[PDB]
Amino acid sequence: AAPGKPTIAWGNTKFAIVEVDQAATAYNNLVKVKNAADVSVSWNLWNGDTGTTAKILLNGKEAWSGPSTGSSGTANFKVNKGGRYQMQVALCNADGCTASDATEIVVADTDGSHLAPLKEPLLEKNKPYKQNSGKVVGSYFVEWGVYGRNFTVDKIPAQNLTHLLYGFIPICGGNGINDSLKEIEGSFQALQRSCQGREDFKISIHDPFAALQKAQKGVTAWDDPYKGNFGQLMALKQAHPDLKILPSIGGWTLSDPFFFMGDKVKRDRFVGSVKEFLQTWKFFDGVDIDWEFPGGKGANPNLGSPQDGETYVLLMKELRAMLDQLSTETGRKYELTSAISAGKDKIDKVAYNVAQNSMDHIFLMSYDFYGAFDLKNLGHQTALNAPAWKPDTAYTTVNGVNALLAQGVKPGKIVVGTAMYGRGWTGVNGYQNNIPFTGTATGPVKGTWENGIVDYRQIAGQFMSGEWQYTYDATAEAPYVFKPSTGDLITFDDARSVQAKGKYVLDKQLGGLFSWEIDADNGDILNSMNASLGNSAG
Amino acid sequence: AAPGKPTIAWGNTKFAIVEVDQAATAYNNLVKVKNAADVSVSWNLWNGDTGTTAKILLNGKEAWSGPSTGSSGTANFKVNKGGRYQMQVALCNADGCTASDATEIVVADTDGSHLAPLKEPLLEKNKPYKQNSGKVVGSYFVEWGVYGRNFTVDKIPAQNLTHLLYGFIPICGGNGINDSLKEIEGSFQALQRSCQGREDFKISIHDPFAALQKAQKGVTAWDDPYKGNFGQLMALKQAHPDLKILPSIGGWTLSDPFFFMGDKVKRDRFVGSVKEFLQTWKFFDGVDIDWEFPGGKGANPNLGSPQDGETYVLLMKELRAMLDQLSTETGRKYELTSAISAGKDKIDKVAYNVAQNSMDHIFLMSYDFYGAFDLKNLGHQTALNAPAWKPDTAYTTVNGVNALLAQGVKPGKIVVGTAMYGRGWTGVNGYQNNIPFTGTATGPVKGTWENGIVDYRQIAGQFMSGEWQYTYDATAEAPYVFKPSTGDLITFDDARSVQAKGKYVLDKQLGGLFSWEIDADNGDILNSMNASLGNSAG
């Protein structure tokens, strides 16, 4: 007669293709890319003839086969695709096969193929939109917002975005390569711990704890291979297969390494590490280059050179050539984008009309025009246009857009930025005709996380009541709150300015809108971004 | 300054003192008694000075110590007591110690020290009693009731018992030693699989799957070392520390090995295997010996000898001497009990007046007096007394008790049995004066699980309506249902007969009441057992 029915032995059922070492702090030791997961099963025959051949089946397809020589057995085999499988053990003899009940096993991959969709309800005032305009709707998610700000991937109103940028992936390098990090306590040392044993000019993960190890909704079990931001990004991708997730390389304190990329040896090393990073972390859909800024004038006063524009253009052609190869090997579409300065002075330094051919989108940083970094020159930090009182204002969204169009950049490539925070000053005095902006400040406003910067959420929450006057400047197309008693003044974006920006994009045929940073919004800014571009309410 | 704060690495947190191999069917390979569990921890220092010495603390007491030579570490140490501990990793230097947040680890033992109390609500008609009479209230739980009967440890109304007997632990041995098992399909072969490589005359587990591996409430996780009946018995003991759990060795089909114990070599081997079993499975509180029966007349017609009574008495003195040693080594009290035949003919074969000195309780099997095993002689299967119509009836509870008292057994040692099932016949005919019991049967009643036997629950549920007449015989003190049309007749115990038995115990100063088998009751029998002995309603 046919063999008796085997019983799957209790044992581990979660295996990984890409493994994360749990007692490793250096990137190089933290991640192990294998070709396949090593799976193992054991069975007991409590009752009956043990058959003559034992088989392991994954979804009814044989993964292993061997002689059934006893009451218990163990099979070791390799699984090369991530997913959840129904595993069965079958005992066979000339009279037939007897299969065990199925046990589900999990083969993890950076695909997020083994995960359940992270599908969370929209919070605060976020409202549902359908992404039907065909315009980009983007925002940045910051790796460190998981601590004090406590804004985790599960809180992102994901259906309201087309593009999610992850700030920020660092470039390895010590003294001389990453000095701007030193201004932030423990930041420089964390990068040297993460980069131990790794070559300078290779990409790494800044905070491996927040990125891969912190338990977050959906990746809370001890044995989940991927936890933290990466693990929830994999799951969110299961839930929204259309959302493009781009790693952002660079930023204000992480831009120093780009200034050395004039050396091709270093550039090729960098480009090869990014190819490797995308092959390691499969849920990412391309790369975002946030070099602040070719020519200098970023965090480090000692860097900047006239060669910068050329290295920038070569870097984009080369990344594009590696993304094009990756695309054809994998069958996916990889995007190459870049966040650039909106100042005409910085735009002038690069040949965007040339660089645009390697790029999918150009994220125009049309924010930070004015702030507590300047106490003498007050103005609208993100206005579309120049104010009435100073028509020649240099820093304007339109000046930014016009500079690029002038170079020959196609309008469709340009994604306009919106701020989800305001910048302010305290002690504004000596203003004329009631425009506090004509006065001078004595300091920076008390901020949410840090001085001079305020989360929109808190602006919306506390500063639109009490002594706070509110004015919507309709010439510049920008709002501002002012508290006369203390001279506190804040420049920010609101649902109306965002609407002005959204209509502008439509009129000029620009590419979409993006914002910095999603954690700071209460939903008003994102709702407005979606609405103004013509996305349908869901 | 003091070291930074370490982060416990994700990893296994469940270790075992006594380990169960998960791909082993033979008792000898299934269980491994170690002196201590082997515990392991890893940590990462994401931020700060790694200190100079690393320590592992279990509830603030150091378990391991070593040089802190980096950002990550691993400690391996031994824990010798089961329990749940708050584990912390601390980094120390001359400026102070910095302790991690606590991670709970589980060190499993057969104590059930690592488990949460299995504290389940009473089901069906079970009502709560306080065990204040000081009388024994016992019942048997059968290992195989977990399948078809589907009665698991979580369904036992545990607060309503003083003693729980687990049926049945087998004695190893093949051809000639365990032939009675052969009458039950696969039973003999299961014992040979369990006993592979183990000496004849050593105790084993019949069904290791039901006993240790079947997922049951409270022991459902893959990594719980103890699942099945044993695992839930450990947990139930956490919940009811006062309930005595006794393994029952023997029974109807497992009694054959006792007949060879006249050879001391075999007896000593048996006694040593039981000491070992109690040291392995710590939630057990002594041993129950169910030798059916010294002198023969059990399942095997080829066994029985006049020496049996002597071997029985020696076996009890020797078990007692090993339990007395175990008690003093552990500081616990171990009970030695025995289930014996209530027939005067079988009682006469042993010197109970002598054996009683080694025994805590004698479970008098005052049930099975009559059944479908005899179609010509009908009678009350568990009556206290003789019926009016046959005053000389041999098989009676009182005849059973009287035989022992006559031998000199102390009344206090005697625990009277109650049935939680009925035995019946079909086609009763030729009865006189309306007593179906004066007729003859033609077969056995259709039973619940098997022919001739009915669960009380089903008697209570289906046969006290319809054509079923009901009569309570107040002379014998026993009820019976009869269906005249088919001649179906059933003898059983009910709440009134149990009350009669309970008052008898009180009057005669007997030890308590016990029943066979708890799965079959709906609560009526147990309620009555508790009530009749004078236990207070809770």
Curated annotation (Swiss-Prot), chains A, B:
InterPro entries, A to Z: Chitinase_II/V-like_cat, Chitinase_insertion_sf, ChitinaseA_N, Glyco_hydro18_cat, Glyco_hydro_18_chit_AS, Glycoside_hydrolase_SF, Glycosyl_Hydrlase_18, Ig-like_fold
Keyword Signal recorded: yes
GO terms for MF: chitin binding; endochitinase activity
EC number(s) on file: 3.2.1.14
Listed GO biological process terms: chitin catabolic process; polysaccharide catabolic process
Pfam families: ChitinaseA_N, Glyco_hydro_18
Catalysed reactions listed for this entry: Random endo-hydrolysis of N-acetyl-beta-D-glucosaminide (1->4)-beta-linkages in chitin and chitodextrins
Record carries keyword Transmembrane: no
Domain of life: Bacteria
Keywords annotated in UniProt: Carbohydrate metabolism, Chitin degradation, Glycosidase, Hydrolase, Polysaccharide degradation, Signal
UniProt-annotated catalytic positions: 292 (proton donor)
SUPFAM superfamilies associated with the record: (Trans)glycosidases (SSF51445), Chitinase insertion domain (SSF54556), E set domains (SSF81296)
Occurrences of domain GH18 (ranges): 135-536
Family: Belongs to the glycosyl hydrolase 18 family. Chitinase class II subfamily.
Protein's UniProt name: Chitinase A
Source organism of this protein record: Serratia marcescens
Phylogenetic classification of the source organism: Bacteria, Pseudomonadati, Pseudomonadota, Gammaproteobacteria, Enterobacterales
Gene designation per UniProt: chiA
